[PDB]
Design a protein around this ligand. Sequence first.
Ligand SMILES: [Cl-]
Length: 147
Amino acid sequence: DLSGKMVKQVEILSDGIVFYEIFRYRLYLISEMSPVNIQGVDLLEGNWGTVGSVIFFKYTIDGKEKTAKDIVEAIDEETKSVTFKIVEGDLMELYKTFIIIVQVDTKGEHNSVTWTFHYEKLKEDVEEPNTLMNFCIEITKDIETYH
Ligand SMILES: [Cl-]
């Protein structure tokens, strides 16, 4: 009832493996590649690119500054998939739980990035995270055009 599901897949003209490795290993590169959207990525715990690593994001949605604390819950090297779990931040004001999965198709001539949100809302009249999805899409376009 309160749980929901959001998926968006976009093609990328950039290299799919590079794109995947950024989200696994090199989140820190994101803030230079999309400075409007993300001001900073801090590794709070663990090593970059491992399940259990904990991370702090400073970002801006609709020109309003926000922060998130994520744990990497799963990684699958075969499908090139990284799962992030939000445990603190502004989104936890609206949603009880929120998961984000980035999964990158690389084996084919056309490469794509798929984004999947799995969430549970605190109340029925909480909005769908469309603003969060467009934002992930903007980021993907920036990484893609960075070269
Ligand atoms: Cl790992």
